[PDB]
Structures are given as structure tokens and as C-alpha cells.
Amino acid sequence: MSSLPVPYKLPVSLSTGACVIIKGRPKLSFINDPQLQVDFYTGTDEDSDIAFHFRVHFGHRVVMNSLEFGVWKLEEKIHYVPFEDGEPFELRIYVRHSEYEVKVNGQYIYGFAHRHPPSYVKMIQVWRDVSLTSVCVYN
Structure with missing residues (x-):
């Protein structure tokens, strides 16, 4: 029952192979x-x-x-x-060449085709009716 502030804003740099992991x-x-x-x-x-x-x-x-x-x-x-x-849930967003791959709670959920290059993403905001325990970007 530790928590992060919500809204949670963190600066990011996203490249193919990166993974955003959100737990809360x-x-x-x-x-x-x-x-x-x-x-x-x-x-x-x-x-x-x-x-x-x-x-x-x-x-x-x-x-x-x-x-x-x-x-x-x-x-x-x-x-x-x-x-x-x-x-508690775990949400993963993997940055692939052509799409974001979304995983939830051990299940593959969706591939969202890129509309803009991920290299232009500068900040991730996580918010609304959640308590958050961590927001991590790998790679």
C-alpha cells in the first residue's frame, strides 16, 4: 500500500525494444x-x-x-x-517497430499500429482512478 503520486508523469525516451511496465x-x-x-x-x-x-x-x-x-x-x-x-494489475506496453504490444496480467491483449514514431514520445502520464505502485521503462 505504498504508492506513487497520481497523476504520475515521467519523462521517457522510447525506442524499438523498450517496455513500459505499469503496476497498480x-x-x-x-x-x-x-x-x-x-x-x-x-x-x-x-x-x-x-x-x-x-x-x-x-x-x-x-x-x-x-x-x-x-x-x-x-x-x-x-x-x-x-x-x-x-x-492489483500489471500493464506492459512494448515498443515494437510497427506497433505497441499491450499485455495485461500475463495475457497478450492488443497490437496498436503506430500513428507517430515512438521516438517523438517525451512523457508518459498515468492517471485517473488508480493507486500506482510503479511505472518503469526498460531499454
């Missing part, structure tokens, strides 16, 4: 419609674009998108992702 717990039970949001920003400013947005509507759906010149682009949706109510 939803802070409310699913009946309260808690959310998790992970944003890969292409700037350090508050108005920066988002190359990869990953948003968990716990108990409902996962949506992914990008914010480009201030506009949300095509939403990609997953109906079911195996987050468990009240339990």
Missing part, C-alpha cells in the same frame, strides 16, 4: 465506474499531442486513440480486457 490497483470498485488512463505525450507542455492514449473504463471497455493537433482520431476499442475488480 483500481482505487474504486467497478460499480463506481473507475477509469485508468495512460497517455504517451509528444511534448512536455500541457497542450501537447498524444501519440498513444490507452483508457480503461473498468468493467466496460478499453479504448485507444491519438490526439493530433488537438483532435481525437480513430477510436480503437476492446470490449473485454481481463482486469479484475479490486485486484
Whole structure:
């Protein structure tokens, strides 16, 4: 029950082979419609674009998108992702040549085709209704 501040912002440099690992717990039970949001920003400013947005509507759906010149682009949706109510989760995002590969709790979930080069990602923000225990970038 140690925790990181939320919103959590960390500077990053992403290259093919990198892996973002996010560990934490939803802070409310699913009946309260808690959310998790992970944003890969292409700037350090508050108005920066988002190359990869990953948003968990716990108990409902996962949506992914990008914010480009201030506009949300095509939403990609997953109906079911195996987050468990009240339990700690592990979210991994691997930076591959052509896509981000998303893993949750030991399961392969999704490959999100790059819309922008990962080399332009400068900061990752993790926020909304979670308690966070760690946010690590490998390689």
C-alpha cells in the first residue's frame, strides 16, 4: 500500500525494444465506474499531442486513440480486457517497430499500429482512478 503520486508523469525516451511496465490497483470498485488512463505525450507542455492514449473504463471497455493537433482520431476499442475488480494489475506496453504490444496480467491483449514514431514520445502520464505502485521503462 505504498504508492506513487497520481497523476504520475515521467519523462521517457522510447525506442524499438523498450517496455513500459505499469503496476497498480483500481482505487474504486467497478460499480463506481473507475477509469485508468495512460497517455504517451509528444511534448512536455500541457497542450501537447498524444501519440498513444490507452483508457480503461473498468468493467466496460478499453479504448485507444491519438490526439493530433488537438483532435481525437480513430477510436480503437476492446470490449473485454481481463482486469479484475479490486485486484492489483500489471500493464506492459512494448515498443515494437510497427506497433505497441499491450499485455495485461500475463495475457497478450492488443497490437496498436503506430500513428507517430515512438521516438517523438517525451512523457508518459498515468492517471485517473488508480493507486500506482510503479511505472518503469526498460531499454
